[PDB]
Amino acid sequence: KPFMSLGISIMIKKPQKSGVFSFLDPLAYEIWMAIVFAYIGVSVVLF
Amino acid sequence: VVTTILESPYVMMKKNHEMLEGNERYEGYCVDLAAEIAKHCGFKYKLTIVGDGKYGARDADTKIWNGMVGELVYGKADIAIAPLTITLVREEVIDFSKPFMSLGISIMIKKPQKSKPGVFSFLDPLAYEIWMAIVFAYIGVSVVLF
Amino acid sequence: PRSLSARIVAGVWWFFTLIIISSYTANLAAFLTVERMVSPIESAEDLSKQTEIAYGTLDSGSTKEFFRRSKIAVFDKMWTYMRSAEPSVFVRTTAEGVARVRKSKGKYAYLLESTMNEYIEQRKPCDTMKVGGNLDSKGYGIATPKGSSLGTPVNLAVLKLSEQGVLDKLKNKWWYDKGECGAKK
Amino acid sequence: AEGVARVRKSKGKYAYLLESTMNEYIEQRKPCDTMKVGGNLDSKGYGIATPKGSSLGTPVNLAVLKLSEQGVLDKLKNKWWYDKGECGAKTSALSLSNVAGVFYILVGGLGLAMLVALIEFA
Amino acid sequence: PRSLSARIVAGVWWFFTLIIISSYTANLAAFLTVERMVSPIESAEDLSKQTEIAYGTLDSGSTKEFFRRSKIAVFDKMWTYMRSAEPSVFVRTT
Amino acid sequence: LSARIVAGVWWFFTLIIISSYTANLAAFLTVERMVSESAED
Numbered sequence: 358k359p360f361m362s363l364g365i366s367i368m369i370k371k372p373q374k375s376g377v378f379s380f381l382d383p384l385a386y387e388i389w390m391a392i393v394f395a396y397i398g399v400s401v402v403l404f
Numbered sequence: 405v406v407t408t409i410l411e412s413p414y415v416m417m418k419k420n421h422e423m424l425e426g427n428e429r430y431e432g433y434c435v436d437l438a439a440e441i442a443k444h445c446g447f448k449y450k451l452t453i454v455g456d457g458k459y460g461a462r463d464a465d466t467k468i469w470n471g472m473v474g475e476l477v478y479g480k481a482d483i484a485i486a487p488l489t490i491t492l493v494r495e496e497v498i499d500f501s502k503p504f505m506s507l508g509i510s511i512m513i514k515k516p517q518k519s520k521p522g523v524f525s526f527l528d529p530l531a532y533e534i535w536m537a538i539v540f541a542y543i544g545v546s547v548v549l550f
Numbered sequence: 551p552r553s554l555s556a557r558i559v560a561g562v563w564w565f566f567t568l569i570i571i572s573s574y575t576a577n578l579a580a581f582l583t584v585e586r587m588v589s590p591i592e593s594a595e596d597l598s599k600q601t602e603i604a605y606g607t608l609d610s611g612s613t614k615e616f617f618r619r620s621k622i623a624v625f626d627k628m629w630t631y632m633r634s635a636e637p638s639v640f641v642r643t644t645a646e647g648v649a650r651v652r653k654s655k656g657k658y659a660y661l662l663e664s665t666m667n668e669y670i671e672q673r674k675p676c677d678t679m680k681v682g683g684n685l686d687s688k689g690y691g692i693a694t695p696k697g698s699s700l701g702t703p704v705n706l707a708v709l710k711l712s713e714q715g716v717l718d719k720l721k722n723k724w725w726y727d728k729g730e731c732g733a734k735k
Numbered sequence: 736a737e738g739v740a741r742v743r744k745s746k747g748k749y750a751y752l753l754e755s756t757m758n759e760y761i762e763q764r765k766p767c768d769t770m771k772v773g774g775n776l777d778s779k780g781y782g783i784a785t786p787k788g789s790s791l792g793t794p795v796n797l798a799v800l801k802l803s804e805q806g807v808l809d810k811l812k813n814k815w816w817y818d819k820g821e822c823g824a825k826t827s828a829l830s831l832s833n834v835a836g837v838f839y840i841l842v843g844g845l846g847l848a849m850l851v852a853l854i855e856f857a
Numbered sequence: 858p859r860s861l862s863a864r865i866v867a868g869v870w871w872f873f874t875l876i877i878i879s880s881y882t883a884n885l886a887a888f889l890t891v892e893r894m895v896s897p898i899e900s901a902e903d904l905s906k907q908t909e910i911a912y913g914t915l916d917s918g919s920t921k922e923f924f925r926r927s928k929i930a931v932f933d934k935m936w937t938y939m940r941s942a943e944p945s946v947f948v949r950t951t
Numbered sequence: 952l953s954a955r956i957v958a959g960v961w962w963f964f965t966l967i968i969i970s971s972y973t974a975n976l977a978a979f980l981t982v983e984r985m986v987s988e989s990a991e992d
């Protein structure tokens with residue numbers, strides 16, 4: 358009689374997921390490039 | 405002779421069972437399964453419900469097995485196809501085939517309705533840790549501007 | 551007037567509370583979308599550690615004998631409770647246990663094998679459910695008298711039907727296919 | 736080991752079909768980038784094999800059932816699977832550190848602004 | 858200006874309406890997230906298995922005979938409920 | 952009039968930005984609640 362019960366399964370690779378940077382990620386680093394260039398670009402116009 | 409027991413959805417009486425006869429007045433999992441086993445072994449069979457309506461158990465003082473296992477040991481039936489748990493106490497008196505269904509003891513409870521959130525649940529989207537920290541930053545900004 | 555330091559501080563703080571409130575809206579939207587509820591009794595140890603929620607098994611069968619013959623701390627404690635519980639916590643039939651759960655107003659928990667539990671979970675008015683993983687690993691088998699001529703063929707037959715996936719199909723036939731609540735203003 | 740290594744070196748392009756036991760084992764092993772998904776495709780089991788018609792068959796059978804009912808097999812599994820697990824072993828929907836780092840960059844702002852003020856009056 | 862009583866009033870009120878509008882945005886987003894999900898169709902075949910909503914055909918015609926003479930897992934189950942249903946689920950006309 | 956419309960359109964700008972942020976983050980946490988069920992895939 359089975360001393361251990363099992364079944365055929367599927368093994369897949371799931372990457373580990375990991376701050377201020379994480380709060381910056383939905384901005385995707387491109388808000389610092391676009392919104393800041395537009396920030397100094399608006400402040401230069403008002404200047 | 406195949407012994408079994410009425411248990412949903414293993415063995416159930418058909419709606420029209422009063423006008424039916426033989427093995428055609430029974431339906432369920434164990435019925436189709438019994439049909440399959442009988443087809444593989446190639447024998448004619450007759451489905452019978454256990455007399456006392458019990459499962460295999462031995463009484464302590466009398467040492468007499470009741471139920472379907474009792475019907476097997478005492479030669480009242482030739483095979484038992486039912487939701488019968490394979491146990492050691494049963495395996496000592498009769499022979500079990502390999503499990504055709506795997507199970508285990510579980511817990512059946514009633515679905516609880518969500519308790520009222522109150523004052524502490526609307527906070528949850530902003531953690532108590534985050535409340536303490538947002539307050540530390542609150543007084544930490546107001547001290548700098550100071 | 552306008553100060554540069556206080557301006558940029560106010561700015562960083564503004565961005566801050568922005569991140570904060572966006573996170574709040576996000577998390578609340580998530581809570582409302584999924585509406586996941588914490589399990590009332592999750593672990594099997596939660597029944598043994600509390601005396602408020604009653605729990606029991608059938609008056610006879612392999613489950614009751616599993617608690618009777620158990621040397622496990624949790625399961626032994628549970629059996630110790632169930633044997634000493636007044637009024638009677640044991641039931642005669644499965645239907646009686648289920649009816650006791652539904653008429654208990656959530657005060658009674660029914661310890662039953664996963665199969666019937668999965669079945670009743672599919673029956674109206676669908677107010678019952680299975681919580682946590684199984685307490686053990688067992689199985690149902692076709693019984694034959696000791697030294698029967700039918701033992702060898704039934705043994706080979708079960709394996710044949712299982713490997714070709716007929717057992718899983720039949721189980722789906724009588725459990726989840728005719729099941730009232732399937733697939734889990 | 737080859738299948739697992741092929742999953743890990745495949746960059747997620749390869750999926751390994753294996754028995755649930757070994758999968759549960761590897762899911763507990765470093766670098767810990769692998770996992771089991773979905774329920775089992777079927778229901779099988781491991782058993783103690785004896786030559787056909789052996790004198791040892793019946794006692795080992797009853798022995799297996801005996802050990803199983805007293806729960807030694809499951810304890811043994813916890814011992815060799817989940818007790819030493821490097822990956823496995825504080826789960827909530829929210830973690831502060833996502834919204835928290837801004838506290839630190841804000842402190843960067845407070846210190847720098849304070850600093851430029853100090854150099855402004857100096 | 859800096860009046861503290863009125864200031865803390867404005868702050869607490871700001872936070873209050875803040876939480877409120879966040880709750881509205883969240884709830885509306887959730888609502889609109891639920892709306893476009895798949896409605897029961899073959900799950901209405903699972904809904905045919907749910908007994909809260911009654912469902913039926915004409916008392917005579919090709920549809921009723923489609924359910925009567927059906928060997929399909931779903932449609933036959935539907936017939937099994939409809940013939941045994943209390944109260945009667947069949948209608949005379951469209 | 953110049954700086955006025957500049958500040959106004961900029962207001963709309965950062966408004967759309969923070970709205971996109973809140974929306975995307977809502978998707979993030981909703982997906983976090985959500986799981987990754989069939990083996991037939």
Ligand SMILES: C=C(C)[C@H]1CN[C@H](C(=O)O)[C@H]1CC(=O)O
Pocket residue numbers: 411459487488489607608610611612613614644662663
């Ligand atoms: C339904 C009954 C009384 C039987 C069926 N299988 C289990 C058995 O074989 O013992 C019993 C249930 C239980 O013990 O909870």
Ligand SMILES: C=C(C)[C@H]1CN[C@H](C(=O)O)[C@H]1CC(=O)O
Pocket residue numbers: 915917918919920921951
């Ligand atoms: C419109 C009616 C009553 C007729 C038309 N064709 C079907 C028939 O041939 O019976 C009926 C509709 C139905 O049975 O759903």
